[PDB]
From a paper:
Transition metal transporting P-type (PIB) ATPase proteins are critical for cellular heavy-metal homeostasis, providing efflux of for example copper, zinc, and cobalt from the intracellular milieu. The PIB-ATPases belong to the P-type ATPase superfamily of integral membrane proteins, which exploit energy from ATP hydrolysis for transport of cargo across cellular membranes. Here, we present structures and complementary functional analyses of an archetypal PIB-4-ATPase, sCoaT from Sulfitobacter sp. NAS14-1. The sCoaT structures reveal that PIB-4-ATPases comprise soluble A-, P-, and N-domains, shown in yellow, blue, and red, respectively, as well as a transmembrane domain with eight helices: MA and MB, in cyan, and M1–M6, in grey, and that the PIB-4-topology lacks classical so-called heavy-metal-binding domain.
We determined structures of sCoaT in metal-free conditions supplemented with two different phosphate analogues, BeF3− and AlF4−, respectively, which previously have been exploited to stabilize E2 reaction intermediates of the transport cycle of PIB-ATPases. The structures were determined at 3.1 and 3.2 Å resolution, using molecular replacement (MR) as phasing method and SsZntA as search model, and the final models yielded R/Rfree of 24.4/26.8 and 21.8/25.5. (a) sCoaT E2-AlF4− (P21212, with one molecule per asymmetric unit). The classical view of P-type ATPases is that the E2P state is outward open and that the following transition state of dephosphorylation, E2.Pi, is occluded, and that these conformations can be stabilized using the phosphate analogues employed here for structure determination, BeF3− and AlF4−, respectively. Surprisingly however, analysis of the two obtained structures suggests that the anticipated significant domain reorientations are absent in sCoaT, and the models are in contrast rather similar. The compact assembly of the soluble domains and the position of the A-domain near the P-domain, placing the conserved TGE motif responsible for dephosphorylation towards the phosphorylation site, are typically associated with commencement of dephosphorylation, indicating that the two structures are trapped in an E2.Pi like transition state. Alignment of the E2-BeF3− and E2-AlF4− structures of sCoaT demonstrates that they are very similar (RMSD = 1.1), and comparison to the equivalent structures of SsZntA support the conclusion from (a–d) that both structures have been captured in occluded E2.Pi transition states. The E2-BeF3− and the E2-AlF4− (not shown) structures are occluded, lacking continuous connection between the ion-binding site to the outward environment. The rigid conformation observed for H657 in the E2-BeF3− structure is also observed in the E2-AlF4− structure. The M-domain is in general less well resolved than the soluble domains, and the domain is somewhat more well resolved in the E2-BeF3− structure than in E2-AlF4− structure.
Author numbering: 41 to 678
Write the structure that this text describes.
């Protein structure tokens, strides 16, 4: 059941019922009865909407279009009524195709958090709903479960994925507090090995977590609420037309009906100037305008779709050109989304190949996500992989150990060599690793036996086309540029430098992104382009929200107004460009579609009929539609 077929039947009936009687061999009950159907199908839907708004609201333009059909029907030139009814039904169907907004992400957002939780009660562990969790409760989050509440760890250690909140799927090691009575009072002193969030996914170990916020006051409950209260962005052209009808419809139907009904000064029959007022009124129904505005929208959206970007409506399509600022998530948006091997720093008498081969020999046995990067990139650099190690063992939260060439190998964080039996870390290599950590490198130190072979550094590299699209967007007038990421500030600064963004903010929560976005939106229109769950509120409050189409979360795709479906950034200088020209195509098509009405309707009070109205109105409608179709031609300029 879809209502577009009534406009199609009015098209078939107008055309074939204009053809059957005239320049045709068809009877007047079959050939002209089609024109009878052309009044019924297109008129009956606009009629019921007219009734719906005339119950309470003041006026509707459908009154003007429908009575413009009806007066031509009860008078001469019924092709005028059928034509106006057909083209206005079609312009209504085109606005309905431009009006499609699913705007629902609550279904995906509700899945991030569980409904129930295990809570400790002395010698028992009860099951309660999360809305019945009290602050100070100890919930038991066991293996690979979704965390049900914000708080801090009091028992157990585990590697937790905080992707829905930090945007980083890189697991973070979590340890219990030293003193929980102290930790509940001093929430500002919670180290990131301790702060846990609802919606995170637990790792291998169970965690007792003391609750901090209530069920609705958690960070993820806040991002749900913030997304739900999004302002539905309205296109500047459409609300302009709403206010314009609010003035134009009653003004014209008052000034050109009863003031033109049976005017005493010029000779008229009391029954025949009754036709004279409706000539002006019926032709005053500005149908060129009702068809110009949605056709440009649909053409621009179709060109964007063949260009590889989804646009959910005309309002973001119009907003993309007017932007002054744009903000970028890092991981998955400006970066590829995976750590590569980017720095090798040998030490002492160790070669580069010894360091890389011992690293790949151990990381072939590990299952941490960095092991796979190390193995594939040592295989890239050396062409080969050495023989794998023996006696793999984990030092939990710090790294790994193995045995290569009858010597004991330790790899991991700087805290590992502070914790195990062998030779301690020299200060110079310590400082080198410190320098790598500050430069945004996740850093592993490698010892083989008595000797430190050295250190190695991995990083999520930016996309190759990032710096290019950044410079292009600066050329197109976007001098307000920033990075806003949940990753730490070293990686944010290093990627922002490597891409060419001047201001980079890391360590941000989703609300902090919303804060930065509102601060930019105060000075102009702003776009938030990202790919994660924690970017969805900043997308929702921005002037236009854009999601990375392929790698992105379903939450961010359902929330965003623009989708970069090729998952590449080179679609952004194209998009804004199209948006600018689209406004030109509607602006021209606005004034024309208005002007000719304002040009043909005073001319209708001074000697014009209903017969020529189709000829002017079609001449006003088709041409503007034709200009909108120029939007189907545009260039990439690669
Ligand atoms: F991927 Al992000 F902040 F969520 F850089
Ligand atoms: Mg992300």
């Amino acid at each position: 059941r879809a209502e577009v077929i009534f406009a199609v039947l009015c098209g078939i009936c107008l055309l074939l019922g204009w053809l059957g009687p005239k320049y045709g061999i068809m009877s007047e009950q079959f050939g002209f009865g089609l024109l009878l159907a052309a009044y019924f199908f297109g008129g009956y839907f606009t009629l019921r909407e007219a009734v719906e708004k005339i119950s309470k609201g003041q006026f509707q333009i459908d009154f003007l279009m429908l009575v413009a059909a009806s007066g031509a029907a009860i008078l001469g030139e019924w092709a005028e009524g059928a034509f106006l009814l057909f083209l206005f039904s079609v312009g209504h169907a085109l606005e309905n195709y431009a009006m499609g907004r699913a705007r629902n992400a609550v279904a995906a957002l509700a899945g991030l958090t569980p409904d129930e939780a295990l809570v400790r009660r002395g010698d028992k562990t009860e099951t309660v709903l999360i809305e019945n969790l009290l602050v100070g409760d100890i919930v038991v989050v066991r293996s690979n479960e979704r965390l049900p509440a914000d708080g801090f760890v009091v028992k157990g250690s585990s590697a937790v994925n905080q992707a829905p909140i930090t945007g980083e799927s890189a697991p973070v090691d979590k340890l219990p507090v030293d003193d929980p009575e102290f930790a509940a009072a001093n929430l500002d002193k919670l180290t990131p090995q301790t702060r846990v969030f609802a919606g995170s996914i637990n790792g291998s170990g169970s965690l007792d977590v003391q609750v901090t916020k209530l069920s609705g006051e958690s960070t993820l409950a806040r991002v749900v609420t913030l997304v739900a209260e999004a302002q539905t962005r309205q296109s500047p052209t459409q609300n302009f037309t709403k206010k314009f009808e609010k003035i134009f419809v009653p003004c014209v139907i008052a000034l050109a009906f009863v003031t033109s009904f049976s005017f005493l000064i010029l000779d008229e029959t009391a029954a025949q100037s009754f036709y004279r007022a409706m000539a002006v009124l019926v032709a005053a129904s500005p149908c060129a305008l009702a068809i110009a505005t949605p056709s440009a929208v649909l053409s621009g959206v179709a060109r964007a779709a063949r260009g590889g970007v989804l646009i959910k409506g005309g309002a973001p399509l119009e907003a993309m050109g007017h932007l002054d600022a744009i903000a970028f998530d890092k991981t998955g948006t400006l970066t590829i989304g995976e750590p590569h091997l980017v720095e090798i720093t040998p030490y002492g008498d160790a070669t580069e190949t010894e360091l890389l081969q011992v690293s790949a020999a151990v990381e072939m046995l590990s299952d941490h996500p960095l092991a796979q990067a190390v193995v594939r990139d040592v295989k890239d650099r050396l062409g080969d992989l050495p023989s794998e190690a023996s006696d793999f063992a984990n030092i939990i939260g710090q790294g790994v150990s193995a045995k290569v060439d009858s010597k004991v190998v330790h790899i991991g964080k700087t805290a590992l060599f502070e914790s195990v039996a062998g030779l301690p870390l020299p200060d110079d290599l310590r400082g080198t690793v410190e320098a790598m950590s500050q430069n945004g490198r996740t850093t592993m130190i490698v010892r083989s036996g008595d000797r430190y072979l050295g250190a190695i550094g991995l990083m999520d590299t930016p996309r190759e086309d990032a710096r290019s699209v950044i410079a292009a967007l600066r050329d197109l007038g976007l001098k307000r540029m920033m990075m806003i990421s949940g990753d730490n500030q070293n990686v944010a600064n290093a990627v922002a430098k490597e891409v060419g963004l001047d201001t980079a903010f890391g360590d941000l929560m989703p609300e902090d992104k919303v804060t930065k976005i509102a601060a930019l939106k105060a000075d102009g229109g702003v776009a938030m382009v990202g790919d994660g769950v924690n970017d969805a509120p900043a997308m929702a409050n921005a002037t236009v929200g854009i999601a990375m189409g392929a790698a992105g979360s379903d939450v961010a795709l359902e929330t965003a107004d623009i989708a970069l479906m090729a998952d590449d950034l080179q679609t952004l200088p194209f998009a804004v460009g199209l948006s600018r020209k689209t406004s030109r195509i509607i602006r021209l098509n606005l004034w024309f579609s208005l002007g000719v009405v304002a040009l043909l309707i005073p001319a209708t009070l001074f000697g014009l009929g209903i017969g020529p109205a189709v000829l002017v109105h079609e001449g006003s409608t088709l041409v503007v539609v034709a200009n909108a179709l120029r939007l189907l031609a545009f260039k990439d300029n690669r």
